[PDB]
Design a protein around this nucleic acid. Sequence first.
RNA 1: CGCGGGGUGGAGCAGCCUGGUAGCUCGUCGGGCUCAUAACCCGAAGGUCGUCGGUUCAAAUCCGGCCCCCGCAACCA
RNA 2: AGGAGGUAAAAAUGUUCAAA
RNA 3: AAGAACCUUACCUGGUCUUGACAUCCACGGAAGUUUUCAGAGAUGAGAAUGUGCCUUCGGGAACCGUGAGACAGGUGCUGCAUGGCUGUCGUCAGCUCGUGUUGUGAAAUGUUGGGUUAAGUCCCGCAACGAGCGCAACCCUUAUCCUUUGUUGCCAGCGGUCCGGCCGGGAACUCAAAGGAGACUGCCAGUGAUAAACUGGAGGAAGGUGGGGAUGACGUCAAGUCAUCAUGGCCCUUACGACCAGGGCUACACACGUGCUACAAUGGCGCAUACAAAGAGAAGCGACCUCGCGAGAGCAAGCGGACCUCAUAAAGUGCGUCGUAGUCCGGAUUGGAGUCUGCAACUCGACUCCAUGAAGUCGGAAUCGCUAGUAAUCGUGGAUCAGAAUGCCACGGUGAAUAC
Lengths: 157, 79, 100, 206, 151
Amino acid sequence: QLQYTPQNRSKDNGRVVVEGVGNLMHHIARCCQPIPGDEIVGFITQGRGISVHRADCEQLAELRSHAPERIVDAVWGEGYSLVVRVVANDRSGLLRDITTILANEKVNVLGVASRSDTKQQLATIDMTIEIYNLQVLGRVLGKLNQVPDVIDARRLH
Amino acid sequence: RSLKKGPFIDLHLLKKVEKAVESGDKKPLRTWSRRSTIFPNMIGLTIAVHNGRQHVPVFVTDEMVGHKLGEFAPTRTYR
Amino acid sequence: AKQSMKAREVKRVALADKYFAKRAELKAIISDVNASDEDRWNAVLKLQTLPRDSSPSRQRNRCRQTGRPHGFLRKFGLSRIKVREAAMRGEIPGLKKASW
Amino acid sequence: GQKVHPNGIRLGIVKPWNSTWFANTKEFADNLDSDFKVRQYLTKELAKASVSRIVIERPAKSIRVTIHTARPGIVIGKKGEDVEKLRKVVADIAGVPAQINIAEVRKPELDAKLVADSITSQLERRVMFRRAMKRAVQNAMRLGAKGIKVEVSGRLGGAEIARTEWYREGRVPLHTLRADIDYNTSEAHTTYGVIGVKVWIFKGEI
Amino acid sequence: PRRRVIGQRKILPDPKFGSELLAKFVNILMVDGKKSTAESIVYSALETLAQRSGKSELEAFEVALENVRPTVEVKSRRVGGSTYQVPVEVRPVRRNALAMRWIVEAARKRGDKSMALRLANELSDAAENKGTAVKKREDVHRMAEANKAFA
RNA sequence: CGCGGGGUGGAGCAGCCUGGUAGCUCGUCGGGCUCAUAACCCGAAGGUCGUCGGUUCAAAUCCGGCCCCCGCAACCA
RNA sequence: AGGAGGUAAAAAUGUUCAAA
RNA sequence: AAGAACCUUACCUGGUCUUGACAUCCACGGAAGUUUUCAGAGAUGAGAAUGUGCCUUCGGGAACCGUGAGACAGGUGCUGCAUGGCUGUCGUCAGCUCGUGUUGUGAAAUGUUGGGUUAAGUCCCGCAACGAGCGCAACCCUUAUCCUUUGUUGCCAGCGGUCCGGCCGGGAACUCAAAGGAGACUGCCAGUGAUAAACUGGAGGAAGGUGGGGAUGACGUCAAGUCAUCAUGGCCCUUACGACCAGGGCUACACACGUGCUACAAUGGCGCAUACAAAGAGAAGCGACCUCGCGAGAGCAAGCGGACCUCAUAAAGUGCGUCGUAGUCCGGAUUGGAGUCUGCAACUCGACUCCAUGAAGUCGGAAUCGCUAGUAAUCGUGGAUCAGAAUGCCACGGUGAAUAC
C-alpha cells in the first residue's frame, strides 16, 4: 500500500558530476544499483540521457563491446535506493522479523520482492529500499544477519 | 523548411565545438543552444543540450546534423 | 505594469537604435546573393555578437501610460482602456464615437 | 456603470475637444502623449490654483495652452512670473515654444470640475460628505444652473461597505444631446481610501 | 407577428414566361443567391416536361402542379388544454405554395443526373399524380380524414 | 456420517436441463433537458461463468475432487 | 346585455451563518 | 489576448544582484559618449585604446556616468465581500421617483389608478389630485430624393484630335465628391372614434406614419466582473513574493465541452474563357511594371506619405468542354520529401510553396441555435493586432429567398 518522488527529486540532482560536469539527465541503472561510496562508471543512452551503471559491471562491460567510446566517467556530488536479498529458513512471522526491524528503523520499504517456494524450507525474500545515511546500512546488516530464520541478509547486487 | 542560407548556430557553441575538435572527443558539452544546427564536424561528441532544467546528453552520429539540437532534448515529460 | 518592465522596454529601444539602426547591414548587404563566401558567414556569425535585444522584433511595444502590453494601438500609443479614457475626456483631437 | 460618458457623446455637438490640433500617425502619438504630459504637469502645479480645464492647441510647431481657472491671479504668480515659469517648464517638456494662454472662468460653482474637487477638497478636509453635496448643489441652483446632479461613492464616512449617493435639481436631459451637460470627475482620496465624485451641470442647448 | 398584421411582399414575375408563380417556384429551389442557376434548372425542367408531355409549359406545369396542391391541412391547434390534431382549410396562397414546396421536396430526393431532369421526371409523375409529392399530399388527406372528427 | 440444490458483469436473476454464439433489471460510465439535483431522453463499457483437474475438436453447459452457500435427514436407542 | 352547456395527464428537491 | 518562437512572460529549472531594472535627495570620484579582446548561456565579470565641449562670480557648468551610506525603492504578492474609475446584465424593458396637497394612528397610498390609444406612465379624456424630474420620443451620425455651392489626382454627355486608352484638346451638364440647404408634418382627403388622442384607406410623394440602421441604456439588481490596465485603503515581502539573464513552459494529452473553419458533392468538382463592387491601408511602409522561379518568392527598380501610386484580374456569376453518383477528378486531414519569407533564431513552436501522400466523412442520437429583410442564406474584399503569425475579432460590398394563418 506504501508503493516518482525520487525521479521528481533526483531531478533536484547534484547527485552526479559526469566527467567534470553535473546537471546531466541521468539515472541509476537497474543492474548494479550504484552506491554513493565506490563511485561509478556512466554510459550514455540515446534518449533518457546518461545511464549510470555503477563502477565496474558486466552489462556496462557488454556496452564496451558495442559502443565503448560513448561510456563516460563521474562521481556522486551528494546511500539512496538499493536492494537486499534475505533468503531464510521458512518464515513463521519472519516477514514481520524483517519489517519489525525496518519499522521505526526508518528506511523506505518498496522492495516487496519476496518469493517463498523452492524445494526445501528456505523462502527466498528480497527487498529494494531507499535507505538514506550510509551508516544506517551498517546497523541493518548487523541487525539482519542476526535473525534466526535468516541465513543471509545483505546487499544483493 | 527554414533559412535558405547558412544552417544557423550560435557562435559560443561553434567555438566550444572547435575547441573540443582540436582537443578531441572528450568531456560532454554545456551547450544551452537548442537552436543551433549540428555541423558534421561534431560527430561522436557527447554534447549535452539543456532541457529547461535538465541538461540531457546526446551522442552525436552522422544523421544528427541538419536536425537542430533541441530535437534531441524533449522538453515536456509525459506519463 | 511594474516599473521594471517599462524600463526594460526603453532599454530595448536604447539598444535598438544603438546598433541595427545603422548596423542591420549585416543581414542586409552581407546576407545577400553576392558574397556567399565565408564573408556572408561572418555576417550570420557576427550578428549574435550584438546584444540579444536591440533587434526590433524584441520591442514588445506597450501603452504610453498604463503600459498594458495587450490591446495597444500603434496609432495613439495608448491601450484601448486609456485611449477611450482620454477620448471621452475630449482629449484626443477629433475622435467622437462613430455611428456609420 | 453603463451610462455613456456625457462629455463624449456630445463632442461633435456642443463640447469642443479639449485638445484641438492636428498631425498624422507618423508624429501623432508623440503630440498626443506630450500633450498629456504638459496637461499632467500643470494638473500638479495648478491644482492649488483651481484650474477648470486645460485646452491645448498645437499650431506651427508651437504649443499653445489655454487654461481655464477660477483664480488667474494665483495661477500667474506675479506679473506673469509663475506663468512664464510654466511656459518654460512646458516647452521644456515639448522641446517647443509654448504660448501659455490663461483664461479665467468667473463662475467657479458653474463648472463641474471646480465643484467636483470642491467636494473632494471637503472630503480631504474630512467634512461630512452630505453637507458638502447639498452645499455645492444649492450653490449651483441659486447660481442659475437649470440643472445639477452630483454623486459620491465608496467608504464615505468610513462605512464598512461602500455606498453611492446623489442629489439633483433641475432638468439634466442626458439623452437630449444638445443639452450642454458639463460633466467632470475628481477622485477623492481618504484614509479609508478612494471615493468617487461626479458632477453634472445642465445649462442650455441651441 | 404577435401584432404587426404586415402586408405581404410583392414580387418580380418571370423574365422568360409570364408567370410570377413561376418565379416563385424558382425561389423555392434557389439555394443561396445562385438564382441564376436555379432559374436555369427551372426552365430546363419545363422544357423537358413540354417535351414528354408535348404540351405547353406555362400550363403543362399546372396540371402537374395541381396534383400535389393540398385541399386541407392539419395544424396542431390545441383547443381546451390538452393537445390533438385539427384539420383546416388551406389558404390558396399557401395552397400552391406548399404544393411547390413538396414537389421540390421529393425532387431534392430521388436525385438522378441533372437536378432539372430528375425534377422533370417528378412533375411528370405529378401529372399522373403518382409522384412522391402527391403521395405526401395524399398523406395530408389521410391526416384530414382520420381527424375529420374535429373542428 | 448422509442425500438434494445452488456459486454467472459492482447487485439480483437468467442462459446449463438437451456441448459451439451469455441476455434482462438496477447499478457504473459518456452526452442532453435543468439555475442546480433527481427524474426523465440519447449512447456506451462491463462477465477468465466458485477453484483445480478431467471428458471433448470445442465445456458457462458434460464428468470428478476441493472451498463456499442453502435445503432435507440424522429414526427404533 | 337574460340565461344555460363545454374548458388544462404528470412536473419532487435546494447544506450552515450573513451586513448603513 | 486588437494576434505566447526569444521578447511578450506574469510560470518553471538553473545561474545571478542587492539601495538595486525604475525615482528624487546627500556625498565621493568622474564629460557623456566612442572602440575593442577574453571568459561566460547570458547577465555580468576582467583588461585596453579613445573622448574629456559653450558658466568659466570657475567646490566648478548643465547633463550623464560609476561609487558609498541611508531615507527609500520594487511587487502582475492577497484582498472586486475594504474601494474609485470601468463593464455585463436584467433591458432599449417603460418603467422608476420627487414637491406641496390629500387619505390613513402607521407601515404606506393616492400622483403613476380608470375608458380608450400608442413602439412608450406616448396621447386625449375622467379622477383628490396639481405640478415637477429621470427615462419614451425628439435634438446627433449614417442612409434614401431634390436644389445650391465649387470641379482635381474626379467625371467626362455634347463638341472637336484619335496609336478608339477620357487617350488628347476641350466641357461643368453627368457620375461623384464633399459643404450648405429643401423635404415628411398624420401636413391633404375619405372613413372610424365621445365635437379627443388616435387608428384605417387612399392622393401625392424618393420617402408615410418611429421610413432603414446606428448612437444614446432609467431608479436599480446580482455584496456579478476586474485590486492584472489604472488609481487606491488595508494587509503582506523587502540579502526577497523585488531586480537581470539563459533554456524551458503558456502549444502539454486516455478524455469532456463551447465557439468556428472545411466537407460529405452533380443548383457540384475540375479545366479554358469571361463580366460586374463597395470598403479601406500604406513611410527604417505600400511597393508598379520588366527579368528569373512550377511556386511561395528573388533581383532590379518607377510611383506614393495618397479621388492620381500600391496592395488590386474580387468570388460566386457567365459561356464552352469535361468528370457521370463512385468515397469516387468529392474530401482534404494526416505524412514524407524539397523549399521560400519573416526574424539574433523557426526542434519544442511560425507562416506560406512545390512534388507526392491522401484518412474521417455519403448530411449526423437525444438535444439545440440564428434569422422577417437587402435579413437568412451564400461569396469574396479589406483593417486593427502585427518582424512574422486568422478558420478569430472588426469592417465592406456581391449575390439573393421562404414564411408569419
